[PDB]
């Protein structure tokens, strides 16, 4: 009933998204599979510029890739359409913008909003992004629990272009109060709005780029395990709040055995493991499931990488396949 | 050349013990081991009292124990001498001690200090800790690269009583400048300061106790692959600079495999693990190094939390071992 390919197949061939996640529970191999099918992406479509980006502070994008990654998109060797990048937590208008922001919001209840640097970080990257001209960007990200990096701005957006509304009307005196306070005149705190609005404005414009099903999806990783599933329907329910699509899941380190596998380890962890891919399939019965099978090595280097993506687009036959 | 005790029984018969950490990447069983290790102590020590807490916004204790545990100690079925917590991320003392903090602060450069939420958060904990009369806390923290909580609260409590002897002196009118800016009298300032200093003292003391290697260790938790070696040199690392003890690594999903196991998969796998497990070895020649043996099942309720903590302090006997 409505088969879905169990594969990133159909993702990899959709040329509209510009935004792909990966995220799941801890160790489930966000890294490893987020790196793996930014190399598949950029491999099938060698006259296009990708971008992969660590949101993990536990950076692991060049370990797993066995390369020196830094600060600004760095191109990955053998891949030169492949550029690799780690973005860490949190010019001089950002300071004066701020200042603006936390003196006016205390005029107000509920008046000290965060997410300021998260903006003007935000800012910077769809600067390296449009300039050089990435047809998708790739985000690794930081395990389930940890706050979901940028997804949040279009509240942080509201809150701040309302401030400018207010401002510019001198709403309850709110104008009066804040030229007092800082000793700026009307046309300084004019100006920082006016100088800043069209900033805001390309924030406000990609945000809404995360929630259209055409531009963003959002991939899971789990591991077939009882706590690993729990962060993954929290993971599900966060994203449907934040209106932001999730139709695809990888299990990962699913094992090639059966009954008849002479290993008692590895038969009776395939015994535990297919419980709860069965609980995945029933309970994401519209999704793409990807089953990423055990290796025999960590996932390090990009021979391992490449092995790795083939297993996302052509689905693993196991001993217990039907 | 000093045969380190590969468990943690030395540990486990410290009972100067006040404060106990597990830690380390994304996945390797900071939850199972901390959850384990605090059964362990609390059926070996019936007589006392402990508190497990989970600083993981992805709380996964009540799944690992098979109990809900919620927000206040809740006491764990079958081991009444044991108590698991949540504890989420940041009286109305609080909200006016804070504006006089943030307004005094911006008198002076880099005045803008954050973690007052993280004080108030530590002690509302104190409160509960000394109260319950726990000998020992037990933390299952947050994976490697998400900020530790509590440890970073000394240089806050510095921050807050330099700012309390300025206003206390007028150094350079900063109170004048408060009084003016908030219209607070003196008393008032004196007052808010007065009343919460016994609260900064009290943090002040029990930071310390963090950095006493006889009231506080700090276990680390790996599995034998490249990227989780990287999380454990960083960790390790952030601890010396924090002056914290960390002498203990449990190396979790050890395979019980070498050349002459049939089962491919653990062969290989044992191969890699070696490898890792000898640079831990090395690298390490001082920590007790816990071999913690990849099991049959997750490890899900009290009876496989018990069977876990039996190889923290008596040591698995490998095909592989010497
Ligand atoms: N299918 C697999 N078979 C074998 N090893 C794997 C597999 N997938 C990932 N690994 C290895 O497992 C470890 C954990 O994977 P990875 O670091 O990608 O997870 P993560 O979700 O990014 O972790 P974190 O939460 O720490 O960011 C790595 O050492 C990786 O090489
Ligand atoms: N030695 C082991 N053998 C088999 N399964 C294990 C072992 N240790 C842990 N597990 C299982 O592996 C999974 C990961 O462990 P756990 O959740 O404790 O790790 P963690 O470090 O707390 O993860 P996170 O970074 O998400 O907090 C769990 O499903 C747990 O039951
Ligand atoms: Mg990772
Ligand atoms: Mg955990
Ligand atoms: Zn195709
Ligand atoms: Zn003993
Ligand atoms: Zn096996």
Redesign the pocket.
């Known amino acids: 009933a409505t088969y879905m390919l169990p594969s990133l197949h159909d993702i990899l061939d959709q040329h509209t998204y510009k935004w792909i996640f990966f995220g799941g ?3 489930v191999g966000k890294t490893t599979t987020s790196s793996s099918f930014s190399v598949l992406m950029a491999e099938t479509r060698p006259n296009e510029k990708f971008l992969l980006l660590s949101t993990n502070p536990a950076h692991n994008i060049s370990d797993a890739f066995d390369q020196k990654f830094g600060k600004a998109p760095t191109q990955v060797s053998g891949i030169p359409n492949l550029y690799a990048m780690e973005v860490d937590a949190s010019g001089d208008m950002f300071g004066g913008l701020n200042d603006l922001i936390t003196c006016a919001s205390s005029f107000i209840k509920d008046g000290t909003f965060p997410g300021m640097d998260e903006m003007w970080s935000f800012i910077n990257l769809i600067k390296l992004i449009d300039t050089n001209e990435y047809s998708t960007v790739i985000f690794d990200t930081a ?1 389930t629990g940890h706050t979901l990096r940028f997804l949040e701005l279009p509240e942080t957006v509201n809150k701040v272009l309302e401030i400018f509304t207010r401002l510019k009307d001198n709403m309850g005196g709110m104008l009066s109060m804040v030229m007092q306070t800082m000793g700026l005149s009307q046309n300084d705190i004019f100006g920082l709005i006016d100088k800043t609005y069209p900033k805001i404005d390309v924030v406000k414009r990609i945000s809404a780029e995360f929630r259209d099903p055409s531009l963003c999806t959002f991939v899971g990783v789990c591991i077939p ?4 599933l729990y962060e993954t329907e929290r993971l599900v329910q966060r994203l449907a709040v934040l209106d932001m699509d999730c139709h695809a899941i990888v299990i990962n380190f699913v094992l090639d055995a059966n009954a008849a596998t002479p290993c008692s380890m590895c038969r009776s962890r395939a015994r535990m493991q297919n419980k709860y891919i069965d609980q995945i399939n029933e309970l994401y019965d519209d999704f793409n499931i990807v089953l990423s099978p055990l290796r025999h090595d960590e996932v390090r280097g990009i021979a391992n990488l490449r092995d790795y993506a083939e297993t996302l687009i052509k689905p693993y036959r196991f001993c217990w396949s039907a």
């Open positions: 529970k801890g160790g395990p395990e009882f706590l690993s």
